[PDB]
């Protein structure tokens, strides 16, 4: 948009997005080349009266994936891990990891793009379950050894958490370092994400936002790949912005490597889980991306949902747009009440 524009057609999305994806609490952040649109609605308790702030606490639930994604392509640009790699490469000492056939191993690149054939849990878990806590990863290598994989890969796509929790495993292992250090290493402490964390203080905690289905906030280092990662408007501000020119800054330098487009729709034979926000016409490291269709532009975009949290980023990266948004739930939310009007926007935007 113009910058004289920005802020006015910010507003005249911004509000209905809150009310229609009856948000209990809701944080908006749009980028727009130079300029940077914040608003926030809403209640950060259900009574309490007290705005979402810059620095409250969030889970972002499934944005996690592009953070586990973002890494996996760093270490790759590094040369600790290959994208083609298969993940019985970096299984602990001894134990076995199943595949469809002999020369069809399960590849990182698999894990990312949600066609490695896992099932999207693993199974056998507590029937009531703190969100973010099970697996843990010995609970997942365990049962990974005595697995069965009968689907080819790159065949389906079949949206995952535990294939990405593998992900971040076989990430941990090849770096010789903790997932917690890679995130803080790789992403978090180059942004200044001071709030971006698998392990948040009671200082922390104690700004979580909280809506309908909210959990304890605690450790979620079991989710470390899938969707456990706490942070906060601010940070994931500064996280989106690496994706985006401006005046001040060029996109980071695997930006582009990051949003590499692996599989086209057609080139899969079934996708399911991909669709949450529209019909997905390309996977990639998580991302997915929407060719431009009715009035909407072409956009790389991501949802997620947890503990009373939903959340979506959507970019348009050619025209240095993006907006990330993070609603905690009333019982009456859907979340494409909210996606739906953050992609409306996006297309007045890049007008």
């Known amino acids: 948009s113009n910058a004289l524009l920005t802020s006015q057609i910010v507003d005249q999305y911004a509000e209905h997005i809150f009310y229609n994806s009856g948000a209990v609490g809701m944080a908006l952040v749009v980028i727009d080349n130079n300029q940077v649109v914040n608003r926030s609605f809403g209640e950060t308790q259900p009574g309490n009266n007290i705005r979402p702030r810059p620095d409250s606490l969030i889970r972002i639930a499934s944005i996690t994936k592009l953070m586990t994604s973002e890494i996996m392509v760093k270490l790759a640009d590094d040369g600790i891990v290959k994208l083609t790699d298969p993940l019985k490469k970096y299984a602990p000492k001894g134990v ?10 399960i590849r990182l690149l698999h894990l990312a793009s949600h066609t490695s054939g896992l099932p999207r849990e693993q199974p056998g878990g507590p029937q009531k379950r703190p969100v973010f806590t099970w697996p843990t990863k010995d609970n997942r290598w365990q049962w990974l050894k005595l697995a069965k994989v009968t689907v080819p890969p790159g065949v389906k796509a079949a949206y995952s958490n535990l294939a990405y929790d593998l992900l971040a495993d076989a990430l941990s292992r090849a770096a010789g370092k903790p997932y917690a250090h890679l995130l803080r290493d790789k992403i978090t402490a180059p942004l200044g994400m001071k709030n971006t964390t698998l392990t948040p203080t009671a200082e922390q905690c104690k700004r979580l936002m909280i809506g309908v ?11 470390a790949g899938s969707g456990g990662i706490y942070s906060t408007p601010e940070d994931m501000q500064h996280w989106m912005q690496q994706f985006l020119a401006s005046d001040n800054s060029a996109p980071k330098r695997s930006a582009k490597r990051e949003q590499a487009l692996y599989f086209q ?14 019909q997905a016409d390309a996977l990639g490291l998580g991302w997915v991306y929407m060719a431009p269709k009715a009035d909407l532009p072409g956009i790389m975009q991501k949802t997620g949902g947890g503990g009373g949290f939903i959340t979506y980023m ?8 993006g907006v990330f948004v993070v609603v905690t739930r009333s019982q009456l939310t859907k979340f494409s009440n909210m996606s739906d009007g953050v992609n409306q926007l996006v297309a007045e935007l890049v007008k």
């Open 213 to 223: 289905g909210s959990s304890r906030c605690g450790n979620t280092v079991a989710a």
């Open 96 to 105: 076995n990891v199943p595949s469809y056939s002999a020369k069809q191993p």
């Open 314 to 321: 959507a970019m348009v990266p050619e025209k240095n747009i």
């Open 265 to 278: 729709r057609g080139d899969l034979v079934s996708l399911k889980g991909m669709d949450v926000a529209g």
